[model samples]
Target chain A: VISEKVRKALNDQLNREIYSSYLYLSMATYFDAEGFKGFAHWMKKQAQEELTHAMKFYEYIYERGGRVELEAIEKPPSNWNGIKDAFEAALKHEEFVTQSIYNILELAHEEKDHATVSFLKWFVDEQVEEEDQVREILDLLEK
Target chain B: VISEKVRKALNDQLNREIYSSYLYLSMATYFDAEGFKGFAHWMKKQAQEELTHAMKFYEYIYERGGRVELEAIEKPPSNWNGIKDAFEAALKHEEFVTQSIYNILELAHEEKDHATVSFLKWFVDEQVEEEDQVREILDLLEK
Candidate 1:
């Protein structure tokens, strides 16, 4: 079984993952309503990816014999002036989440949960990949 | 401002919408892992639609000057016997939600909240449309 602190941290990350999906869905709606189907489809894909990310945490909690808890997700801002505004908004959130994931890794290290630390390695790399992906989109828009 | 009863009912529906999205996401993951990309994309669209569905209720609550409340969503079943099994499960849940929407309409009527009742008409029709859509998919697969 996982320690209480580790369990709590994982659960927090899970909720963040869920919230990220919700945020992306809101972004999708904004784009769709504004007649941007391509952008909306892209956001919808990200929303789907975010949920699957949460499922990993959800399954991990169960594997560790810990109860998964949830929290209310705050409403995401839907008004973006342009594509760049939306991408910047998304990138900012990604950075925030990257730090949050790092915090979890640090907590696991403190608790000396080797198993949890190893499991988190995948997420660390994922954060880097996502940041890179988002940056690529932002960079492309400049040209 | 809306009455407590109306506000609570709307909040309940919002949470149910959110939960429905989560369920579809789980199903999408199930399909993707099984190498069913077509089914996975279909499920992902449903998940995105569900989130947008919840946003309607979320906005309604605020419009009525009521605080939106949320509750924990229980984990959905990931294991389905086959394509039919997954679709059937989704159909069952849609029927359940249909009943829930009816209950909310009835409550609004009893409370004599004309505005709330009128607002619910859209959801009532949307639920019908969804049930029809799901049934059509099921029917097409039979051949």
Candidate 2:
């Protein structure tokens, strides 16, 4: 079973997930204004998926006999000059998430809490995918 | 345990995932046509990621003892005149995936297949990320 510290960490992550949703919604608005309906569609789906991810964390914390603490979510920005602007912001955000996941894993390891370590394994692998994707976009930006 | 039939059905979703790649690439091409090199480059990378997602499904199907039947990909639209249109399409695609995942989960429930449900859990959570990004873009457009 995960400790209270880990439980709180998961809750924070849940908020981050929601924040991501908010961020995507903002990006969708930007794309929509520029008349890129397809891109807007994609962002809308991305926002929806983020909400679901938040719920998943919430559910997991409860299932593991941990308290679910709700936190305040920051207001997401809702402006963009173009796709370039949006992608630049996205890459930065992805990098932030990668750092956050890495920190959680570090804690899990330090605590020597096998359950937390096992739970975090999924996130560690996921971060790899996330970083890879963001880096690819960053590379595109550079080219 | 998940039945092979259910696994196959889930695997069928892979086709749509690949189509997502195509759709994004088409959007990128649209931007390229408009001389938005940065936008095009970004979408191209996104398309590649979607292709990887399709491959992931192919791998998952094989892992689950299901046949990986490749199908002809439908042509994606390459004439989005505005950036908003492209993002709109993205939001729509993500929403569509949510429905598809819901259907797959419903089938899994019908079959009382824990393993299939477990496998779907990844997708179930993934939708949140998908939806949030689109929503952010939409909000940005509004502002």
Candidate 3:
């Protein structure tokens, strides 16, 4: 079982993941409409990955006998002026997610939640990989 | 337990839901990037709805003691020449899903699987609502 704080935080995180999926999807549409099929493919793939992340948290909550509270997701921004701007936004968003994950990790550590900590480790690593991937796109967009 | 044929068909339907989610997201991305935030918002919401539909099938299969065979989704088309083309495609896709759902309904009836038939009624209704919604958009695009 998880503390109410941990449960709420995790639920929030799940909502964020859903929003991330929407954000990347919006970016993908933009790229595709602008005739950037390669970029669109990358963003669409990211959208799919984000949904998987959300499902992981969803299953974990149920496994722990915790009730999942799904909150409404805020709409993501609908436009960017150019490829560079869009990717820069993506990089920044990934950094924000990394920080959110770290905050959850710190909370789990404080509560001595070993199982939660173990479960979160994969996400920590995933965040790192995604941040790196986003940076690579940013670098390419800069060129 | 669901029969093997029903299980396989449901799994295929689940995969189609995932693909539908992708299709709507791609359309959302295009509308947003093209500065049609209203259209983008509608498609993004539709994408989220489709994912929920996929999860419903995923859970239903497990509830029936059936394995969910998740096939790889085919990549959705990334671009449409214009907004009209995109909406037209959306309408056509919804029609396809409606027919697929009908096929499942028929199979469930053939096996006298009332539980499956009962569960699918919501989808039968949903397809009507969505098809009508898409047609409205196509009409507006046509005008």
Candidate 4:
């Protein structure tokens, strides 16, 4: 079983993953309404992927025999002034999520939670991909 | 091959499903940050359910030999004034989604898209559960 602190942190991360899903969907909406169907499609897929991230956390909690606690997700912006604005926001949010994962990793390390630490490496690697993707999207938007 | 009209409408529905996932995730974040772990947990699960709903549409489009052309999802609000406000919004959104499904069903009926019509019936049933669950949450919040 995991320590209460680790358990709570994992649960918090799950909630963040769900929020990431919402954030991408919001971006997709803005793109779609603006007639950028291609951009919207991209964001929709991203949103689905974020949900999978949340599931990973959910399953991890169960495997560790920890109760999966959940919390309220904050609202994501419904509109962006422009496509560029949306892409910038997406990049910014991914960075934030990357930090959140790092926070969890640090906590696990401090607790000497080797199993938890190993499980989180996947998330850390995912953050690199996520950040790189958003960055590329932003670059494309710039061109 | 699915007609363009039917194909387009299904794609739009898929976007809406993604948005619903986002909406619930937003609610989950609010609950988590506000220290209402129970409420957050509930919304997290709801978020996952929405993703499943989206996937159902994705599979249906593929089965129909139609391209799943995703569109823009609308931005969901990032903040609810309170827990009660969040549930009210959830209920309102579910009602809206229920109407959306009905519109699709009506269109499928008019187009004589029997396969699509039968597929949508599942969504119609799901909406009933969605609305009822939100209503119950609202009731609890009201108490």
What's the TM-score of every candidate structure? 0.59, 0.47, 0.54, 0.58
What lDDT score belongs to each candidate, Candidate 1 first? Answer: 0.82, 0.69, 0.80, 0.80
Report the error of model 2 at residue B44, Å: 2.2
Model number 1 iRMSD: 9.1
Total backbone clashes of candidate 1, pairs 3 or more residues apart or in separate chains? 0
Q: Whole-model lDDT, candidate 1?
A: 0.82
**TM-score of chain A, all candidates:** 0.96, 0.84, 0.95, 0.95
Q: Model 3: clashing residue pairs?
A: A29-B29, A29-B30, A30-B29
Candidate 2, DockQ score (0 to 1)? 0.02
Docking verdict class for candidate 4: incorrect
lDDT of 4 by residue, A15-94 (tens): 88977887887676567656687888899899978878887886688668765544555657778778888888888888
Q: What is the TM-score of chain A in candidate 1?
A: 0.96
True contacts kept of each: 0.00, 0.00, 0.00, 0.00
Q: Second chain only: TM-score per model?
A: 0.95, 0.87, 0.94, 0.93
Candidate 2: misplaced stretches above 4 Å? A1-143, B1-4
Q: Please give the lDDT score at residue A127 for candidate 2.
A: 51
Docking class for candidate 2: incorrect
The candidate with the higher lDDT, 1 or 4, is: 1
For model 2, the interface Cα RMSD in angstroms equals: 22.8
Q: Residue B118 lDDT in model 3?
A: 88
